[PDB]
Amino acid sequence: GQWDRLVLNTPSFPSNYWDKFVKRKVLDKHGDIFGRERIAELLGMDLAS
Amino acid sequence: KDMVVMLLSLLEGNVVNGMIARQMVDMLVESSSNVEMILKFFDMFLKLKDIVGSEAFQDYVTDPRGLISKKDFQKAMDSQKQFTGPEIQFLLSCSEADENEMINFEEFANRFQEPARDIGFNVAVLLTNLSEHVPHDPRLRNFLELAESILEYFRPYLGRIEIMGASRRIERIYFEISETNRAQWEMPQVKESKRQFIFDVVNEGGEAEKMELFVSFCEDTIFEMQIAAQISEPFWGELEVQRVKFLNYLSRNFYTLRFLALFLAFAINFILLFYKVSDSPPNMVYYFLEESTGYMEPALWCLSLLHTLVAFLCIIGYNCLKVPLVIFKREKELARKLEFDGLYITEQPGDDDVKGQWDRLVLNTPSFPSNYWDKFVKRKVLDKHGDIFGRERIAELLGMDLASLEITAHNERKPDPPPGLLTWLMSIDVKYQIWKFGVIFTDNSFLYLGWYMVMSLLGHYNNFFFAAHLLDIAMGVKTLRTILSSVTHNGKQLVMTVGLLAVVVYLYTVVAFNFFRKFYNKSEDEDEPDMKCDDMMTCYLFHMYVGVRAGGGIGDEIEDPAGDEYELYRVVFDITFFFFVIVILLAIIQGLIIDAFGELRDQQEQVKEDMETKCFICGIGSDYFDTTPHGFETHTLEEHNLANYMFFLMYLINKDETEHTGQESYVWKMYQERCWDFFPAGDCFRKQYEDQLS
Amino acid sequence: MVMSLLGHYNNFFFAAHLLDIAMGVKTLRTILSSVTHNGKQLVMTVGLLAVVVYLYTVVAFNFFRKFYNKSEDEDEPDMKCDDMMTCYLFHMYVGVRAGGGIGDEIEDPAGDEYELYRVVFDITFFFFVIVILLAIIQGLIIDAFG
Amino acid sequence: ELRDQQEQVKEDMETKCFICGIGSDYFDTTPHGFETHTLEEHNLANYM
Ligand SMILES: Nc1ncnc2c1ncn2[C@@H]1O[C@H](COP(=O)(O)OP(=O)(O)OP(=O)(O)O)[C@@H](O)[C@H]1O
Ligand SMILES: Nc1ncnc2c1ncn2[C@@H]1O[C@H](COP(=O)(O)OP(=O)(O)OP(=O)(O)O)[C@@H](O)[C@H]1O
Ligand SMILES: CC(=O)CCCCn1c(=O)c2c(ncn2C)n(C)c1=O
Ligand SMILES: [Ca+2]
Numbered sequence: 001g002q003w004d005r006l007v008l009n010t011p012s013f014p015s016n017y018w019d020k021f022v023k024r025k026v027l028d029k030h031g032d033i034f035g036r037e038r039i040a041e042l043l044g045m046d047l048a049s
Numbered sequence: 050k051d052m053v054v055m056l057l058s059l060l061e062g063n064v065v066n067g068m069i070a071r072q073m074v075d076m077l078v079e080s081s082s083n084v085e086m087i088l089k090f091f092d093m094f095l096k097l098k099d100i101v102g103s104e105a106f107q108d109y110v111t112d113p114r115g116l117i118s119k120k121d122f123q124k125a126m127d128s129q130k131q132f133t134g135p136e137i138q139f140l141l142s143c144s145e146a147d148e149n150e151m152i153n154f155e156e157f158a159n160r161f162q163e164p165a166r167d168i169g170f171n172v173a174v175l176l177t178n179l180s181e182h183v184p185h186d187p188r189l190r191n192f193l194e195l196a197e198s199i200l201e202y203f204r205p206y207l208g209r210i211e212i213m214g215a216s217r218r219i220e221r222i223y224f225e226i227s228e229t230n231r232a233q234w235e236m237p238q239v240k241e242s243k244r245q246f247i248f249d250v251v252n253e254g255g256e257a258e259k260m261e262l263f264v265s266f267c268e269d270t271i272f273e274m275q276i277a278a279q280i281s282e283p284f285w286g287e288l289e290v291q292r293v294k295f296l297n298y299l300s301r302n303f304y305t306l307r308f309l310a311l312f313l314a315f316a317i318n319f320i321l322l323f324y325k326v327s328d329s330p331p332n333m334v335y336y337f338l339e340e341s342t343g344y345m346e347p348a349l350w351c352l353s354l355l356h357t358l359v360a361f362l363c364i365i366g367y368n369c370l371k372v373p374l375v376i377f378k379r380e381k382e383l384a385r386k387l388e389f390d391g392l393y394i395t396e397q398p399g400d401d402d403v404k405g406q407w408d409r410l411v412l413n414t415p416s417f418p419s420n421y422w423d424k425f426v427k428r429k430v431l432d433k434h435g436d437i438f439g440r441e442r443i444a445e446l447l448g449m450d451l452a453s454l455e456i457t458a459h460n461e462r463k464p465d466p467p468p469g470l471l472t473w474l475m476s477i478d479v480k481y482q483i484w485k486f487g488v489i490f491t492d493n494s495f496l497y498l499g500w501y502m503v504m505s506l507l508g509h510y511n512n513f514f515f516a517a518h519l520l521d522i523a524m525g526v527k528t529l530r531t532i533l534s535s536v537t538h539n540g541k542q543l544v545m546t547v548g549l550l551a552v553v554v555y556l557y558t559v560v561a562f563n564f565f566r567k568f569y570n571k572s573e574d575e576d577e578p579d580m581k582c583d584d585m586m587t588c589y590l591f592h593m594y595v596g597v598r599a600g601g602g603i604g605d606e607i608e609d610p611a612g613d614e615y616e617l618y619r620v621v622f623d624i625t626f627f628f629f630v631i632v633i634l635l636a637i638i639q640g641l642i643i644d645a646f647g648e649l650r651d652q653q654e655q656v657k658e659d660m661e662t663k664c665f666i667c668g669i670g671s672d673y674f675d676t677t678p679h680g681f682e683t684h685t686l687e688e689h690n691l692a693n694y695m696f697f698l699m700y701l702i703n704k705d706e707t708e709h710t711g712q713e714s715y716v717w718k719m720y721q722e723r724c725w726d727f728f729p730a731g732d733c734f735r736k737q738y739e740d741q742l743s
Numbered sequence: 744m745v746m747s748l749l750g751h752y753n754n755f756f757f758a759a760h761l762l763d764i765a766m767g768v769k770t771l772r773t774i775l776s777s778v779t780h781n782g783k784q785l786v787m788t789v790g791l792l793a794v795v796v797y798l799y800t801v802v803a804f805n806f807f808r809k810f811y812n813k814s815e816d817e818d819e820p821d822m823k824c825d826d827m828m829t830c831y832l833f834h835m836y837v838g839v840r841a842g843g844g845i846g847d848e849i850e851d852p853a854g855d856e857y858e859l860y861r862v863v864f865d866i867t868f869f870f871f872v873i874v875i876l877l878a879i880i881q882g883l884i885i886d887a888f889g
Numbered sequence: 890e891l892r893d894q895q896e897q898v899k900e901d902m903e904t905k906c907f908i909c910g911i912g913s914d915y916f917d918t919t920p921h922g923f924e925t926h927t928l929e930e931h932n933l934a935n936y937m
Contacts, residue, residue, distance in 0.1 A: 032128065032130045032131075033100075034104070034105060256917075256921075256924075321801075322827045324804070324827045325826045325827070326804070326826075327825075513801050513805060516798055516801050519794050519797070522790075529787050531784075532788055532879060536879075579853075594846075595843075597866075598843030598846065598847065598865070599842070599843060638874055638878060639878045639882070642875065642882045643878075645882075646883065646885075646886045647889065648892070650886060730917070730921070731917050731922070
């Protein structure tokens with residue numbers, strides 16, 4: 001887990017694994033409770049983009 | 050909460066699709082809007098609590114005092130999106146906002162939790178009961194969905210069991226489980242005790258006595274729980290409180306002290322490896338360490354002192370932690386034997402029962418039921434057996450003052466004695482103490498600890514005695530314990546095999562003495578002959594000592610028979626020795642060890658298979674339950690959880706008797722009468738209501 | 744790869760690559776898995792053997808030093824158990840390997856006051872180490888097969 | 890082989906009636922049913 005922390009903010013996170021929308025799904029799931037901006041910072045997400 | 054209790058009392062004895070349950074559902078439907086309002090009240094405040102705990106709300110919080118503006122609160126809530134705008138307005142109205150409109154969200158959330166808890170739990174129980182007893186009603190589903198949050202919150206605290214009731218029908222019982230009880234159960238020591246109990250009952254436990262053993266395990270578990278609570282970390286009085294703190298610390302850290310003692314023993318022996326013996330000092334030899342540093346010699350003295358101290362501390366910790374359960378079980382079994390078996394009143398011990406002869410003492414002692422909860426066992430035993438066996442004789446046996454018994458009931462008396470050392474000494478009960486000390490000294494763990502202590506003391510006399518403490522690794526390590534249990538499993542057989550080997554070697558010795566003496570010279574010089582078998586005893590020692598150790602037998606170690614009239618007799622002698630002793634008997638030892646491994650393995654495997662295949666309570670197999678998906682898992686976790694049965698026992702104990710329901714009073718009465726028929730056996734809610742449920 | 748590179752430096756490093764047969768062959772993989780199944784138990788058994796040999800070494804040092812001469816010439820005595828460390832090494836190295844134990848490798852006790860103590864010493868060493876502990880290893884392997 | 894022989898004897902006796910041939914499951918449908926069946930209903934000592 002400590003190692004896996006790194007790849008989260010990386011753009012390439014779901015390279016081999018098919019699900020490329022996991023970040024948006026995780027955001028839609030947990031952003032109301034945990035903060036959208038914080039989820040985006042964790043996952044390397046540009047909300048404006 | 051009281052009204053809901055009345056409703057549940059109406060539901061007592063309800064069958065599936067019962068008229069009263071359907072009537073309750075119809076009433077709820079008629080009152081749907083207000084039911085919705087109540088459920089919404091509860092869920093809103095629960096979500097308020099979880100939100101305020103949420104860090105996102107803290108982001109909106111920007112004031113050092115910890116207060117929040119009403120506008121900021123509304124923005125936080127609309128960001129969370131759980132609440133509608135009317136709900137946010139109502140929450141703001143309930144919030145006590147100062148003239149500045151700032152709010153203490155902490156108190157705002159915590160205000161309604163405790164007041165609404167009991168009603169919330171009773172509502173959850175009501176909805177659950179109605180859902181299970183009316184499985185197919187669309188109208189109840191809406192209420193369940195609205196109560197989802199309440200049900201989720203109270204899920205860990207809702208305990209569900211099944212019993213066989215006076216209706217002669219399986220019945221489902223819902224009750225409350227306390228956080229403290231659940232945590233105490235989840236403590237690892239209780240988990241290990243449960244595992245050992247399961248192993249014991251499955252391997253060597255009968256179905257008839259399984260329930261009795263389970264109840265005894267639950268009671269012992271309760272005693273361990275209260276001991277753990279007592280030791281749990283939060284001039285005479287100062288001395289006593291510091292003493293209690295020290296003893297509680299020892300009880301809590303007993304195992305750590307054991308590991309520390311192991312570490313010190315290992316270090317001491319590592320140092321001892323450096324010892325050397327010389328004729329000269331650094332006609333008698335001198336033993337001394339050989340280390341250039343000069344620091345290890347003081348270190349050995351210090352380590353010996355600390356190891357000795359830790360052994361003493363471990364003994365004290367054992368006395369404080371573990372002996373209470375030993376005495377509790379001993380007192381309990383004696384009390385049950387008196388009340389139900391009527392042992393010392395009618396039967397008397399076999400006279401080969403040292404434990405009974407010893408237990409005779411504590412009966413007349415006042416302190417008899419010290420650890421064990423039942424303080425009225427003497428009066429109960431008297432009321433039971435006094436008409437037949439004589440009240441005065443029962444009182445003499447049990448140290449009872451009949452005149453005092455009635456006056457205690459007549460009037461309450463408080464002859465409190467002022468605290469004094471002399472008063473404490475007079476109070477001490479020497480006979481009960483002697484009985485306790487006998488029990489403890491018979492206890493094996495205490496004996497091993499005392500031997501540990503004594504060997505450390507002897508190590509202070511001669512440091513090499515400390516090596517014995519290295520043997521503690523067997524008890525310290527489960528792996529070595531099991532490996533050695535492989536040997537112990539067949540130890541009697543191994544000893545008998547060794548005796549048989551002795552007998553065969555003795556017969557071979559007889560043959561050699563009478564016929565083969567000439568061959569046993571072991572001296573190179575002819576002038577000085579060393580003959581082993583001129584004496585029987587010496588011949589026997591020679592055989593048992595050299596021949597058994599030799600791969601080829603004694604023929605390896607004695608003179609060649611070539612060119613002798615007895616050559617063929619001796620070749621038979623040697624080959625038969627080799628095959629019977631070196632090959633077969635050894636083979637017997639190897640095979641006994643291997644079979645011990647297999648037996649232990651199949652024991653664990655059998656325990657696991659039985660638990661995965663059957664309910665510990667029902668006795669019903671996993672196949673019937675798995676007819677429904679995940680049915681066995683649901684049955685074990687929810688329907689027939691043994692931990693839930695234990696929690697029910699605790700809940701009954703802590704609940705007032707006037708407050709018990711019919712079900713609870715029924716089960717409690719069977720507990721007191723030690724009747725286990727309320728436990729379901731061969732029946733379940735599903736099986737009873739199969740046609741209706743499906 | 745690294746061992747091949749080192750083989751280029753010294754050709755004998757290439758022998759390590761012969762160990763690849765275990766992963767190459769399912770049969771050897773299973774046979775070795777028989778050992779691995781109970782490897783922790785085997786290591787603990789070895790440690791226990793070390794402990795028992797250490798205790799026997801202690802007894803020999805305190806009581807049975809005279810018997811541990813291994814020099815033929817009287818002028819030059821080679822005594823193994825004048826030092827604990829050396830006594831422990833001697834035991835663990837010769838006695839365990841010996842079928843009859845350390846008594847096979849040390850001086851006969853006949854005509855000595857400690858003769859019976861030493862016969863007990865030798866027989867108990869033989870039974871506890873040569874017979875039982877080894878037996879534990881064999882049985883662990885067999886149980887792994889089963 | 891000797892161990893599994895004794896174990897098999899024990900399992901068979903605890904699982905079936907020496908007389909009926911019926912298993913303990915059917916009887917344990919009723920509580921303690923197998924024990925009652927063996928002691929009272931179909932005791933071989935009672936047959937003797
Ligand atoms: N009446 C019963 N009550 C509870 N468990 C039962 C019962 N009958 C059979 N079982 C089996 O008991 C097992 C209980 O699991 P167990 O307590 O051993 O879990 P664990 O691995 O120690 O971890 P944990 O309890 O923390 O999840 C369940 O798998 C279930 O198969
Ligand atoms: N038809 C049967 N009649 C009697 N016993 C049966 C029968 N079928 C199976 N059994 C089994 O036989 C066992 C009889 O017990 P057994 O005679 O071996 O007891 P014990 O340990 O020798 O002691 P004791 O008879 O003194 O209580 C019972 O446990 C029962 O499970
Ligand atoms: C219920 C049974 O047979 C085992 C006894 C242990 C349960 N139990 C009690 O019943 C009890 C009690 N204190 C008062 N009472 C009536 N404690 C502590 C207890 O464990
Ligand atoms: Ca009442």
